[PDB]
A paper describes a structure:
Intraflagellar transport (IFT) trains, the polymers composed of two multi-subunit complexes, IFT-A and IFT-B, carry out bidirectional intracellular transport in cilia, vital for cilia biogenesis and signaling. The IFT-A complex is composed of six subunits (IFT144, IFT140, IFT122, IFT121, IFT139 and IFT43), mediating both the retrograde trafficking (toward the base) driven by the dynein-1b and the ciliary import of various membrane proteins across the ciliary gate. Here, we purified the IFT-A complex from protozoa Tetrahymena thermophila and determined the cryo-EM structures of the IFT-A complex and its subassemblies at a resolution range of 3.6 to 8.8 Å. Analysis of these structures reveal that the apo IFT-A complex is composed of two rigid structural modules, the head and base modules, and presents two distinct–elongated and folded states in solutions, the latter of which was not identified in recent IFT-A structural studies.
In particular, IFT144, IFT140, IFT122 and IFT121, share the same domain organization, from the N- to the C-termini encompassing two tandem WD40 β-propellers (WDs), an array of 12 to 20 TPRs and, except for IFT140, a zinc binding domain (ZBD). These four subunits are distributed into the two modules; the head module consists of IFT140, IFT144 and the C-terminal half of IFT122 (IFT122C, 706-1246), whereas the base module consists of IFT121, the N-terminus of IFT122 (IFT122N, 1-705) as well as IFT139 and IFT43. Intriguingly, the N-terminal WD40 propellers together with the first four TPRs of both IFT140 and IFT144 in the head module are organized by pseudo-two-fold symmetry, in which a unique α-helical insertion between the second and the third TPRs in IFT140 and IFT144 allows TPRs at the junction to lock into a zigzagged configuration in both shape and electrostatic complementary manners. In the head module, the ~15-residue linkers between the second WD40 propeller and the first TPR in both IFT140 and IFT144 make a sharp turn such that the propellers of IFT140 and IFT144 point to opposite directions away from the central pseudo-two-fold axis in an elongated conformation. The C-terminal ZBD of IFT122 attaches to the other side of the IFT140-IFT144 TPR junction to constitute a compact core that is further encircled by the TPR array of IFT140, burying a total of ~2500 Å2 solvent exposed surface area. From this core extend out the TPR arms of IFT122, IFT140 and IFT144, the most variable segments in the head module. A frameshift mutation at Tyr1077 in human IFT122ZBD (equivalent to Lys1013 in Tetramymena IFT122ZBD) that would disrupt the head module core causes the severe Beemer-Langer syndrome with early infant death or Cranioectodermal dysplasia, highlighting the essential role of IFT122ZBD in organizing the head module core in IFT-A. Structural comparison shows that individual head and base modules are almost identical in these two states.
Numbering used by the authors:
A (entry chain A): 940 to 1251
B (entry chain D): 641 to 1084
C (entry chain E): 380 to 883
Write the structure that this text describes.
């Protein structure tokens, strides 16, 4: 993606969405790769594109960091004078970035810099997620299931729990948590130079209480241990938000990962053949444009069984 | 084709064989020499030199003369530089290598050591197909490049490939070619042939043997032609290569032949070429020609973008009404978001199959019929979100209906007990028993 | 003067006073006499097209004299004996004067320089300051700047600057790196320096009677190279410093500027001569159709001096001599020109060269390539130092083990990556059975065995090393008379050929 951007000469007045997508792709690639110097990449195009897109989109801290990195790099003489001139020009610009662009880490509620080692935040040790079409951060968190609980009956039990947790007004935990969130609300914001701490704990739910207790435990231990959930929280959950990834078609029993979306308003679509996440807007637009899954390189579900003997 | 007749003029029917004879190992073959047709007879044998009789046909006299020809042994070819004490060490090492007596030969070579002697060591080790002594010698060259080649080549199941690589490192291409043919390996030989310079021979070998790396060979030949400044040959081998849509414009702009690029794009008549040329025209402030080439490339998003740059919304509206492109409508609605044209923006978002944005905007602005019409044709998630919003609204009956038409029917059943209706409740009961039977009929 | 060998139509501007200072901008024209300044404009900004006559926009008067006038496109700088001021040429409706530069010292600015967007001011105290036009801020400050500053000359964009200082000294300054660079072989009475619009690397210095040309090189291995280009007629015989090339200039003529290897020489009767420097002059003289061999060798020599490696490559391919091919390949390799070096070496007839060249073209990292080029071409210690300076010292350890020095390799391995101690130690074992020191082999092999037995992970390599070390102890114990242990450990080991060799 970034090479298809860079080889094309840039438009002086280009679309803001295209620039944002290119910046996100470059930042994600730089964060994920870092220093492995694998076969295929040159580590110069990414930095140059990130610098140009940041200069066009403020991003003063990232621009300075990538410009220093490129100064440590060697480039063809066509770009050196432009790079030094842009660096000296940006020297006069204010620091502290521009906000409203740094990714928001879930289970932390804190703001982190765009370039943070192997695509993880400083507050916790949790892997980020991105929609491959737009390379935009997704509001998703990872959780595990007890070995005693089996997934097949887990599905039916959580379905029954979601179904029962609506009409019966006797006792339910979901509506209790919703009402507690509506009644009591704590929202604090603190400003710093690079970071921002968001104290948003209005939603008092058993899941979030267990999450914050586990986060304090991990801070005490200074290590990462994935959260393990018991039957009560599992019953307290619903059906639409879960986005479990299965590798059963390749291996009948290898592993299974479970993810929860904090924001239920945003819809996410998970291709199980390639096990990749997408935003329904971009995924639907791409499917309408072409009937092939981009990373999966497989047929679309809406179409018929194209897999016949002739194609085989 | 004719590879056995013309070579017999200089080849004779006499071959020389060298042997070391002892009681322990009996007789062992050491080396073989092919005598040319000019060589008439074997004169004698000496340690540093071998002497033969050669005819003198060029003499005009009736009686042709005969001269002595002095030649070096295979292990002594090249070493012109003081041969007084080395012969003993070389003979001892070869003799001990005949029986593979490693340590005796190593301790015999210990006392002298010399880089030229070490390269002769490595050459004869390659000749005798021994690897450990060969890599030890390559360690003793202080030849870091050969060691790096060893390290990068050792990751190969075939030892013959490593031997051929060492032959390349020691500069005899014929032995490496023979080894590659012996091992039935052609890709490494194809790479070597591509490197050395005979590109056409490499192309022929690839097409008759591999045919897989043929595209790579074409690309490499095109790159070589580009280095040779042969623009026509470079572009030709680009179209015979796998990719030519992007390499040709890049080389043309590197050279600066704008008119040649124009001739090429007019001859090709391809949409990506039109898009590239229009983008370049817009970059160099040729707006009208860029618009014309965009029209020839059918990129309506670009016309909407350009007309939005100059705030010429009327022509953009006409274009989106005529072509009815989806992304053009999407970007037009994006502009209308800033332009304060919410109804038309929502309509265009609905047309562009972007459901959630339009339905969420209308839910904030309070439109009822449009959002349910959108959700009826939308996916399950949009249906759920819109009908939950309708639950949040003052009228819940329509939310019940949209659940009934939505993907969640147990929710409709539970609402049926909640609102304690009977007719719609019994219809929902019929629907839920239908879905239960549908699920039970799949597999049991 | 856009075109070559001909002069376009001149345009007349009317005046009634005779100024002693003249300044030219992209659009305006400034005429300055003592305490009087005149400004002229063409059309009204945008694109000229048709050009109108001289328009008197604003007559400017000063309390002091006008020492110097500068005008880039949009702002104008006026110098008086003690103070510099700024002005806007297009607008006169604005009643707010420009922010006056300088500080409480209020001393005369020794050096002033206008670029497209930046203003450089250098004071008599020896301090250079960078000023942003639209922001009006001091972005870059450098107070020490060696001993004392006399004269300054910036690039047309401000990327480079050259400072002439007391006792006839010269220095090069880069705002990005904020570090000075001393200069050598410079005349002490040169008055001006002209940059080249074609390439920022090349520039020229005007002595009172001679022209000197200099080039900045950053692609040179482990060095930023600045040197006066020499003249040489030897057939690759000598590569040593010599007299610099000097262009003979006529008496009382001032070249206006140098661009594309062409100098705008001005001579009386209003004559403009493009001429050429006597380094690119023979470059333009050579045609390459038939010519001769001495001329072709001179063309190759001057291309090598000017680093025109494409002309060097064509001059090489004309003459099939192998030594010239080797020299050109070595020079291109030393100037990190990978493609030219590969082509020259392939034309020479070597494959081991091109294998490593193609392997090197893969890596785009900086220190890794610098060290690899050093270790292929010349010395090895500098390559090791470069690799240590890089982020992959394991390559340096491998290179040191490759030379088998084993005096610095072991120390480096212990210093950086002590987890590879066993394998390298095994190599020492071979060396310690090469020198005949049988006893030391026992302890070296035993230490290696203990080290590899400590780590149980990845049992394949551990088992291979164990078998090899067991063979080593078996052979060294047999050689030392320890028959029982050697024959026993030969019994447990299973690899047949090694046991056969030990029995032999
Ligand atoms: Zn976190
Ligand atoms: Zn997929």
């Amino acid at each position: 993606k970034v090479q298809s951007f860079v080889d094309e000469p840039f438009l002086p007045l280009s679309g803001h969405a295209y620039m944002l997508n290119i910046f996100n792709a470059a930042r994600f690639a730089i964060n994920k790769l870092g220093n492995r110097q694998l076969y295929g990449v040159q580590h110069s195009y990414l930095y140059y594109s990130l610098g140009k897109v940041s200069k066009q989109l403020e991003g003063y801290k990232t621009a300075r960091i990538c410009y220093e990195k490129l100064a440590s790099y060697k480039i063809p003489t066509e770009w050196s004078e432009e790079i030094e001139l842009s660096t000296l020009l940006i020297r006069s610009k204010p620091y502290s970035d521009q906000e409203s662009l740094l990714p928001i880490c879930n289970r932390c509620y804190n703001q982190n810099p765009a370039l943070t080692e192997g695509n993880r935040c400083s507050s916790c040790m949790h892997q980020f997620q991105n929609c491959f079409i737009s390379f935009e951060n997704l509001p998703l968190v990872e959780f595990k299931l007890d070995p005693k609980i089996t997934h097949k009956r887990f599905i039916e039990l959580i379905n029954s729990d979601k179904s029962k947790t609506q009409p019966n007004k006797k006792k339910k935990k979901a509506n209790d948590g919703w009402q507690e969130s509506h009644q009591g609300d704590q929202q604090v914001l603190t400003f710093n130079n690079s970071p921002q701490k968001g104290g948003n704990d209005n939603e008092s739910s058993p899941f979030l209480d267990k999450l914050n207790e586990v986060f304090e435990i991990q801070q005490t231990t200074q290590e990462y241990i994935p959260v393990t959930l018991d039957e009560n929280i599992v019953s307290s959950l619903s059906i639409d938000e879960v986005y479990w990834v299965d590798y059963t078609k390749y291996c009948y029993t290898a592993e299974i990962k479970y993810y929860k979306s904090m924001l239920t308003d945003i819809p996410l679509k998970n291709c199980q053949e390639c096990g990749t996440f997408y935003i329904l807007d971009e995924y639907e637009f791409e499917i309408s444009k072409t009937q092939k899954c981009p990373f999966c390189r497989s047929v679309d579900e809406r179409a018929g069984p194209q897999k016949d003997v002739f194609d085989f | 084709s004719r590879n056995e007749d013309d070579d017999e003029k200089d080849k004779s029917n006499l071959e020389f064989y060298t042997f070391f004879v002892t009681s322990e190992n009996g007789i062992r073959k050491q080396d073989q020499y092919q005598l040319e047709s000019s060589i008439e007879a074997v004169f004698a044998i000496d340690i540093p030199k071998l002497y033969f009789i050669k005819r003198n046909k060029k003499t005009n006299s009736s009686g042709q003369n005969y001269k002595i020809v002095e030649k070096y042994l295979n292990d002594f070819v090249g070493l012109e530089k003081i041969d007084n004490q080395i012969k003993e060490a070389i003979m001892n090492f070869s003799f001990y290598l005949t029986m593979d007596n490693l340590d005796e030969a190593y301790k015999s070579v210990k006392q002298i050591q010399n880089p030229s002697i070490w390269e002769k060591m490595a050459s004869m080790c390659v000749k005798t197909k021994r690897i450990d002594v060969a890599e030890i010698c390559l360690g003793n060259m202080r030849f870091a490049r050969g060691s790096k080649a060893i390290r990068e080549q050792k990751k190969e199941p075939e030892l013959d490939a490593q031997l051929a690589m060492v032959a390349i490192q020691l500069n005899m291409k014929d032995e490496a070619v023979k080894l590659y043919e012996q091992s039935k390996r052609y890709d490494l030989y194809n790479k070597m042939l591509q490197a050395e310079g005979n590109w056409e021979k490499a192309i022929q070998i690839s097409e008759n043997h591999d045919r897989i790396n043929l595209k790579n060979t074409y690309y490499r030949t095109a790159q070589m032609y580009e280095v040779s400044n042969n623009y026509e040959q470079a572009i030709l081998y680009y179209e015979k290569s796998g990719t030519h849509v992007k390499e040709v414009p890049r080389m043309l702009l590197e050279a600066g032949q704008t008119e040649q690029l124009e001739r090429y794009i007019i001859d090709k008549n391809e949409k990506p070429l039109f898009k590239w040329w229009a983008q370049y025209l817009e970059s160099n402030y040729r707006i009208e020609l860029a618009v014309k080439f965009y029209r020839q490339s059918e990129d309506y998003d670009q016309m909407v973008r350009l007309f939005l740059t100059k705030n010429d919304v009327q022509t953009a509206s006409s274009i989106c009404s005529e072509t009815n492109n989806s992304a053009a409508c999407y970007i037009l609605a994006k502009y209308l978001e800033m332009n304060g044209q919410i109804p038309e923006a929502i309509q265009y978002y609905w047309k562009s199959q972007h459901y959630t944005q339009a339905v969420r905007l209308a839910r904030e602005k309070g439109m009822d019929n449009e959002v349910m019409s959108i959700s009826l044709q939308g996916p399950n998630q949009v249906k759920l979100q819109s009908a939950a919003y309708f639950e949040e609204k003052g009228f819940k009956q329509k939310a019940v209906e949209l659940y009934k038409k939505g993907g969640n029917l147990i929710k409709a059943y539970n609402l049926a007990q909640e609102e304690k209706l009977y007719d719609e409740a019994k219809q929902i009961a019929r629907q839920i028993e239908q879905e239960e039977d549908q699920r039970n009929k799949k597999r049991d | 003067t856009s075109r070559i060998n001909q002069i376009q139509n001149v345009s007349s501007i009317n005046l009634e006073t005779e100024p002693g200072f003249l300044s030219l901008g992209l659009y305006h024209l400034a005429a300055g006499i003592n305490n009087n300044v005149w400004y002229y404009l063409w059309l009204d900004q945008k694109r000229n097209g048709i050009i109108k006559g001289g328009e008197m926009i604003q007559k400017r008067d000063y309390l002091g004299s006008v020492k110097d006038i500068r005008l880039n496109e949009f702002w104008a700088a006026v110098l008086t004996d003690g103070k510099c001021i700024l002005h806007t040429i297009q607008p006169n409706n604005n009643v707010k004067d420009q922010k006056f530069p300088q500080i409480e010292t209020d001393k005369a600015i020794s050096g002033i320089g206008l670029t497209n967007d930046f203003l450089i001011m250098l004071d008599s105290s020896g301090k250079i300051r960078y000023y942003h036009l639209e922001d009006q801020q001091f972005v870059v400050e450098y107070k020490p700047a060696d001993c004392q500053l006399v004269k300054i000359y910036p690039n047309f964009s401000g990327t480079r600057v050259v400072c002439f200082d007391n006792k006839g000294s010269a220095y090069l300054f880069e705002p990005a790196q904020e570090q000075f660079y001393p200069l050598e072989h410079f005349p002490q009475r040169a008055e001006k320096v002209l940059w080249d619009q074609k390439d920022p690397n090349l520039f020229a210095v005007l002595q009172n009677d001679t022209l000197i040309t200099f080039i900045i090189n950053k692609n040179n291995i482990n060095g930023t190279l600045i040197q006066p280009v020499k003249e040489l007629l030897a057939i690759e015989d000598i590569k040593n410093p010599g007299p610099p090339v000097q262009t003979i200039l006529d008496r009382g003529v001032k070249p206006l500027t140098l661009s594309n290897g062409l100098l705008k020489c001005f001579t009386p009767s209003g004559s403009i001569n493009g001429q050429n420097l006597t380094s690119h002059s023979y470059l333009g003289s050579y045609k390459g159709r038939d010519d001769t061999d001495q001329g072709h060798y001179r063309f190759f020599l001057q291309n090598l001096q000017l680093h025109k490696y494409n002309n060097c490559l064509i001059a090489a391919q004309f003459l099939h001599n192998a030594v010239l091919y080797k020299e050109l390949g070595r020079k291109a390799l030393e100037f990190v020109d990978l493609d030219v070096a590969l082509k020259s070496y392939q034309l020479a007839g070597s494959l081991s060269m091109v294998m490593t060249i193609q392997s090197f073209q893969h890596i785009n990292e900086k220190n890794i390539i610098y060290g690899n080029i050093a270790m292929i071409l010349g010395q090895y210690d500098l390559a090791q130092e470069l690799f240590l300076k890089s982020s992959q010292p394991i390559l340096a350890l491998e290179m040191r083990s490759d030379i088998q020095d084993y005096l610095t390799a072991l120390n480096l391995a212990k210093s950086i990556a002590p987890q590879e101690e066993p394998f390298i130690c095994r190599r020492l074992a071979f060396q310690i059975e090469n020198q005949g020191n049988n006893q030391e082999a026992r302890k070296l092999y035993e230490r290696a065995v203990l080290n590899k037995d400590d780590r149980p992970s990845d049992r394949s390599k551990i088992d291979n090393h164990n078998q090899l070390c067991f063979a080593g102890i078996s052979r060294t114990s047999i050689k030392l008379g320890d028959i029982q242990r050697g024959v026993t450990i030969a019994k447990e080991l299973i690899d047949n050929n090694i046991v056969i060799e030990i029995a032999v």
